[PDB]
Design a protein around this ligand. Structure first.
Ligand SMILES: CCOc1ccc(S(=O)(=O)Nc2cc(CCCC(=O)O)c(NS(=O)(=O)c3ccc(OCC)cc3)c3ccccc23)cc1
Length: 285
């Protein structure tokens, strides 16, 4: 009975939506608005609480990058402010290891971060850990085998096919095999022991291609492409399937939600969001 939560996003301006999709019955839930609009944020869940991390308020009155961490309790339908990050991080990536949230990369103004910081919910504190080898905004993050992977992005000059791996016990980063495709703004997740990179922007076009990394063969392999080209898409895994939400296709802010079945290597349309948007944060609880 877990739900797919989508927070924030962008259509004409940054959005305040929190909505939840129930894949069992197809219902969409309209939940409490974020306290401040944001796009380019990431979502994650620790201990049944949903967290909205980073991003930016792109508004008619100006644009402000966010250092915010906000905590949503599904039992109370209430957002509460948590401790802010050391620095604003728009187009951030996040992963969770052992109950701690890692905020990876992103931008503050024209500064493209390589820094990474770790949130401990029991203490409501952030601390910096070792920075990545590469500055990355629009970065995808996946956690596998208690290791954290930072995939793709944009370093301020180069759009990246590179990826790297963080070892929390050693507090160090190592480059891994780069993807077949340059991707910023991709959806990155873990499914059945593989890291998936879906969509994104390769410097020329939004992408519908999807590739996955096998950590033991150290190889990236293309799988079935999605039905729509998407950059700045939301992504999550629910019941052994990947769900991708929204994104920009080069012309339209999509409302489409597709689902990847790894057993059949096929994508299907499962629902539409209540309105088209990109740059959402997504998580499941
Ligand atoms: C008409 C599109 O308007 C938009 C489109 C998205 C939005 S957002 O709120 O989701 N924030 C975000 C913006 C951009 C950069 C988009 C800049 C752009 O499209 O010109 C990202 N980077 S990207 O890797 O996806 C990309 C980069 C260059 C590009 O070059 C195209 C020439 C195309 C796409 C984001 C990556 C992750 C999360 C949020 C992102 C707001 C307005």
């Amino acid at each position: 009975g877990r739900l797919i939560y989508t927070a924030g996003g962008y259509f004409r301006q940054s959005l305040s939506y929190l909505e939840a999709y129930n894949p069992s019955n197809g219902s969409w839930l309209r939940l409490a608005d974020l306290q401040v609009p944001r796009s380019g944020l990431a979502g994650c869940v620790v201990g049944g609480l949903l967290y909205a991390v980073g991003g930016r308020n792109n508004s008619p009155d100006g644009n402000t990058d966010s250092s915010a961490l906000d905590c949503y309790n599904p039992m109370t339908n209430q957002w509460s402010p948590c401790a802010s990050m050391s620095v604003p991080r728009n187009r951030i990536g996040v992963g969770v290891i052992d109950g701690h949230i890692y905020a990876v990369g992103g931008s503050h103004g024209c500064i493209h971060h390589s820094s990474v910081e770790r949130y401990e919910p029991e203490r409501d504190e952030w601390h910096l850990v070792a920075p990545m080898l590469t500055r990355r905004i629009g970065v995808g993050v996946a956690v596998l085998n208690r290791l954290l992977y930072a995939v793709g992005g944009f370093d301020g000059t180069n759009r990246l096919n590179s990826a790297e791996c963080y070892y929390p016990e050693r507090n160090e980063w190592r480059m891994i095999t780069p993807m077949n495709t340059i991707r910023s703004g991709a959806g990155v997740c873990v499914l059945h022991n593989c890291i998936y990179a879906a969509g994104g922007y390769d410097g020329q076009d939004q992408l519908n291609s999807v590739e996955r990394y096998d950590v033991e063969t150290e190889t990236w392999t293309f799988v079935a492409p999605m039905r729509h080209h998407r950059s700045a898409l939301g992504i999550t895994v629910h019941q052994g399937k990947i769900y991708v939400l929204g994104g920009y296709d080069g012309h339209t802010f999509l409302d489409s939600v597709e689902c990847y079945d790894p057993d059949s290597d096929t994508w299907s349309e499962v629902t539409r969001m209540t309105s088209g948007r990109s740059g959402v944060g997504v998580a499941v609880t």
